Design a binder for these strands. Structure first.
Ligand SMILES: [Mg+2]
Ligand SMILES: [Mg+2]
Lengths: 679, 679
DNA sequence: TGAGGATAGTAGGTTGT
DNA sequence: ACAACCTACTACCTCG
DNA sequence: TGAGGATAGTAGGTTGT
DNA sequence: ACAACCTACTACCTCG
């Protein structure tokens, strides 16, 4: 295909002198000894109380600072039991940089080296591994300061590596009554002047704090005064705050002692649009700069921006198209005779003429007969909705649209719960709505359309796989949801999903994971007529150890090839063009069976965040994976102009679980897996 | 109805003297003060380090011991942050016994008083609030010492209340090598001689402990000798134990230092398998006895066994019948034209024509046609099962039957996962069945036939509700499943179930709770032709506060009456007939709106465990609820001779969640709610 | 509930030595 | 602890 | 994987002051 | 903690 070289935010630092290679090690002995469950954290707690630049190593600690300056004896409380530890030093033994586990110690030694160095400079703001040396913009109340997040680790080469990404931070120092005093609206949240605890503001209130009632038989002005908060400051106006953990019940508070906590929505009254989002040319300009400023401070030598070769993936064409929205009026890759319905409580309304026209123009271009219909909804008793479903059943229903005043989630889901029971997919455009914002109706329908298959574009390129499936965990924080979406066809794709299953954790049961992948193998021969030669195995996030083991074997037994790749948004740094403009689609090899892949980038959203991908299993070339993987990004049909960063099975998959974890799956029998009901 | 009086295991004790009403209270002050997350547990830790007879009382402790003997200053570590506490006494102040919260403290005071008294007597075995004074049965290795579980609480009346239930304990004092020495099979589990930790036993290889190799530069024999456990014992034969938490991989160990942990399976070789379950007339005899022995030790005067008035409930004329097995030969309350299929991997070639005969006759006495088809299944590819369900679907598969060599749970569930995928209920009987021993086949299929939807029996009685629904939380330990089952007609019963939904806790979402009850209200009038005038609201376990609030309101809105009751398996009672024989069905009003209900009892399976029931909401009489409740006990089809203790919606529900919790929910799309697939 | 991303921001979780 | 990843909210932004 | 219950036994969890 | 309740295993038992 094609090629360009890319800078990376990583930097090249000094090769490690010997006295770093050889850390003093200290054997830990502690009373009472701890059962293995508590041992790794007890040691880390020891690494911090011992002090110095020390980190746990195995059943002992390693330390770049000599034992003569470490606190070798003391006490620590972990869980309930309280322990005393002692440390018995030993002469230092070199550590192998090739050995992962010993470089894990020289990496941690490097993290804690860099961090110790950061405290000792002033006047700088340091927040863990993030440093903030400059001042982006100033307001009377506030300032926002600037800098980057750092990391200093050790490579296999035995040299120090530096990672820089610029990040900003907002600093409000005014009280709540002064911030209000400039006629600015109340902040979403708010913090005690005297401490960390953060409230959530509700209303200003009227009462006189000298006269207000407290359960204590004390007064608001008095209670705070007793506790001595208001020697520095004067309380003034009475605020009503409420705890985020439990919003009920409102708790009284004096504004003079609350501090607003600002966001861009509070900052934008004072600064219009403040570019916290950095344009790639400036981000890359700050990264190089700041890294020099570290290196001039650190003494690890001058950094040489690490460069990686890179390759431009072939542009992927949706078809009938440059953006799916362009496709909406004209012919879809596929079209089917279809029916749709309208129901809502403005109330009440009629279907307007403009919506139909768009549907007609597209049906007209493609050549497929279009229907539309009406429905009328009673929500207080709710009985009819089923009766509708039977009438909605024929002919036809394949997706449904609603518009109402926007609802509180508790009300929004409860209506989405009652919606699904009768087997209806649904989409909302909050109203009132106008032709004035076209996009809110163009994409709110483009989602309804996929909500009856399909508004699809499918690739025309040549790809080694001919079936793609996506897996992730989503849903309540307490336990997760494993589900899966799928892409049918090597050249002409199709979109469908699999009911997810409840597990206690991120790990997906091996037995299930294969079961769903199997459920997508049934799909290929549903019309494909044969077993797909090769299937594509992506994973959202990390891939757990051998979670696929059952699944990949069971492919081989049934005669199907495969490749397995990890997709993680979080890892993988940043990618800058060594010369020239930036480009929307890229592959960088990096090392071995891992590569970075840039699925999306616009000149105006800021610097793009590139995917890190490892080839976990399978034989196909990395470039081949990128070549399909990049094109896969485009196929999403509920985004008329924006392309998810995750290819649709993962992205579709992300939606599927999250909606499933907010909605539930109780009522989802009647709904088809043709629907693509989440969007 | 009918009438008899009953004793209760509770005992009348002394009215509290004043010096017990008036406990000393101590106010707590602790540095640092804790957030309210940690305040109740920190105070309890305080009441425990303070010593004496002390318990938490809100902001401060309360104490039956004078401060002058309490430890008023010390340290305590909770959650990894240590605290010093001080206590300041404040005279004493009487506590109201009518106030629940102050009697909660006097109840706690009573608990810790009883417990402090139990330690000070000898030679008794005391295990928390459980005490063991006499020796039931001796083996050369073991003893099974006996006694009762107690509790001592304060009444609204102001007098101490005593609850006694006799319980036994098995204490084995001898090493693993000697217990094997008497030619007895290896216990399922085993414990360290030198400590609490217990292992799970596996095998004992031939390795010679003097030369077996430890992961360290050590040897099994030499290892334990290093730690000096061998001073009082000899190691002898090598054992191979395995950790329960992670069974792989086997861990080596010396039998001379392990101790078998015996159950009634291991005592049964020695003791003619004596069953710890007492006969009701001995257990009753022990309760009175033991309470006297306590009472003569306690100094609260003499206990008077508390009696409660009691009434005999209606005997269900299940139809029609005396036992649902009786129904099997005769006509079912609802025979329907029906089909069955057969598959197995034993593999027996064929259907054996003794089972068929029984099926035909009942369908030939009722007058209902029937068929039994055949199936053949390939498990290596499994594709065919899909072709079977299409054949099976028409017209033969109402329910299915398999028989297979005993399956590990991993393999057992994995096959049942496959079973559902094609919407196939299933029932196993292991190979090898022998016709001669009927019950395993007679009930194995009474489970398969209700898995077709015949309702074997229904009552003839007159009941105030005409629809009964059951709710429980069931599933994995980490997160729970909420499901519901129901009974269609008061006069004539039907059995069906509702899909379950996944939650993080015992609380079932009001929005789901009502949604399910609504799904059983939708069901009733599928053929009822009316709204049910009254519906029955039972709950498994406690009813969380206001879980039902949305549900009960939404009833009253749609014109339906209701009554609400809490059913607690472990709700506390034991009931004894003051005179005469014990009987199967009973109702006792307790002073509160709650009542005890004895759903099942057999003269041979021990003292029965009666149900505690509160009337939470509604207006029907307690007797009426019991009167319906006790009959619903029997409706369960799937037990040929034995009647569940929970009425079938609750019981069916428990089974419903549990299978869902291990099987899953994802495969089960096709299966009908008709099926009753779990059993 | 309009879509996507990338900014700060909240308040966390799991996996695996 | 800890690392490298995930979770699910709100609130800027402009429309390949 | 035979049904239920009641015995001991394991190894825990939730809810609500 | 703590209480009063639940959870899901195995292993006796005999067939309302
Ligand atoms: Mg978005
Ligand atoms: Mg049983």
């Amino acid at each position: 295909l094609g090629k360009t070289e890319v800078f990376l935010n990583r930097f090249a630092l000094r090769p490690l002198n010997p006295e770093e290679l050889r850390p003093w090690r200290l054997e830990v002995v502690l009373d009472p000894p701890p059962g293995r469950e508590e041992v790794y954290p007890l040691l880390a707690q020891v690494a911090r109380r011992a002090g110095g630049v020390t980190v746990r190593m195995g059943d002992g600690l390693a330390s770049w600072s000599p034992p003569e300056v470490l606190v070798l004896e003391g006490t620590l409380a972990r869980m309930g039991q309280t322990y005393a530890y002692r440390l018995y030093p030993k002469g230092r033994r070199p550590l192998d940089p090739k050995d992962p586990g010993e470089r894990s110690v020289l990496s941690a030694l490097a993290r804690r080296l860099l961090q110790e160095r950061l405290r000792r400079l002033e006047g700088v703001w340091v927040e863990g591994l993030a440093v903030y040396r400059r001042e982006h913009a100033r307001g009377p109340g506030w300032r926002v300061l600037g800098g980057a997040v750092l990391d200093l680790w050790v490579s296999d080469s035995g040299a120090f590596l530096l990672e820089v990404d610029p990040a900003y931070r907002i600093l409000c120092e005014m009280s709540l009554e002064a911030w209000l005093a400039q006629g600015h609206p109340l902040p979403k949240r708010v913090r005690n002047a005297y401490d960390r605890r953060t409230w959530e503001l509700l209303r200003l209130g009227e009462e006189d704090p000298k006269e207000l009632p407290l359960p204590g038989g004390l007064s608001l002005l008095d209670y705070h005064a007793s506790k001595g908060r208001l020697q520095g400051r004067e309380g003034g106006r009475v605020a009503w705050v409420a705890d985020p953990k439990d919003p009920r019940k409102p708790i009284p508070h004096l504004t003079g002692l609350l501090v607003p906590v600002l966001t861009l929505e509070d900052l934008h009254e004072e600064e219009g649009s403040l570019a916290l989002s950095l344009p790639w040319e400036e981000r890359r300009r700050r990264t190089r700069e700041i890294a020099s400023w570290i290196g001039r401070r650190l003494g690890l030598g001058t950094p040489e921006a690490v460069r990686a070769q890179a390759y431009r993936l072939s542009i992927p064409k949706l078809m009938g198209v440059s953006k799916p929205a362009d496709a909406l009026r004209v012919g879809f890759y596929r079209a089917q005779e279809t029916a749709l319905a309208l129901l809502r409580l403005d109330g009440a309304q009629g279907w307007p003429e403009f919506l139909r026209r768009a549907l007609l123009r597209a049906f007209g271009a493609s050549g497929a007969s279009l229907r539309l219909h009406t429905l009328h909804a009673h929500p207080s008793q709710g009985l009819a909705f089923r009766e509708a479903l039977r009438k909605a059943k024929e002919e036809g229903v394949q997706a449904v649209l609603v518009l109402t005043p926007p609802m509180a989630w508790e009300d929004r889901n409860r209506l989405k719960a009652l919606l699904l029971r009768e087997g209806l997919p649904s989409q909302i455009l909050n109203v009132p709505l106008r032709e004035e914002e076209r996009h809110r109706w163009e994409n709110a329908l483009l989602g309804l359309l996929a909500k009856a298959g399909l508004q699809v574009v499918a690739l025309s390129g040549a790809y080694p796989a001919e079936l793609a499936v996506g897996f992730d965990a989503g849903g309540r924080e307490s336990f997760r949801f494993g589900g899966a979406a799928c892409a049918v066809g090597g050249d002409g794709g199709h979109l469908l999903w699999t009911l997810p299953e409840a597990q206690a954790g991120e790990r997906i049961p091996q037995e299930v994971v294969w079961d769903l992948l199997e459920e997508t193998l049934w799909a290929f021969r549903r019309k494909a007529g044969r077993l797909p030669s090769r299937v594509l195995l992506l994973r959202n996030g990390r891939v757990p150890q051998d979670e696929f083991a059952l699944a990949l074997e069971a492919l081989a037994r049934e005669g199907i090839a495969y490749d397995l790749v990890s997709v993680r948004k979080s890892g993988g740094g940043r990618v800058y063009p060594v010369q020239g403009r930036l480009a929307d689609g890229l592959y960088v090899p990096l090392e071995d069976k891992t590569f970075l892949l840039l699925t999306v980038h616009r000149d105006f959203r800021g610097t793009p965040r590139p995917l890190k991908l490892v080839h976990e299993a399978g034989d196909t070339p990395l470039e081949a994976l990128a070549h399909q993987i990049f094109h896969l990004t485009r196929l999403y049909p509920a985004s008329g102009f924006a392309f998810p960063r995750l290819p649709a099975p993962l992205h579709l998959a992300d939606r599927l679980v999250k909606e499933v974890g907010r909605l539930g799956i109780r009522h989802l029998k009647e709904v088809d897996r043709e629907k693509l009901f989440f969007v």
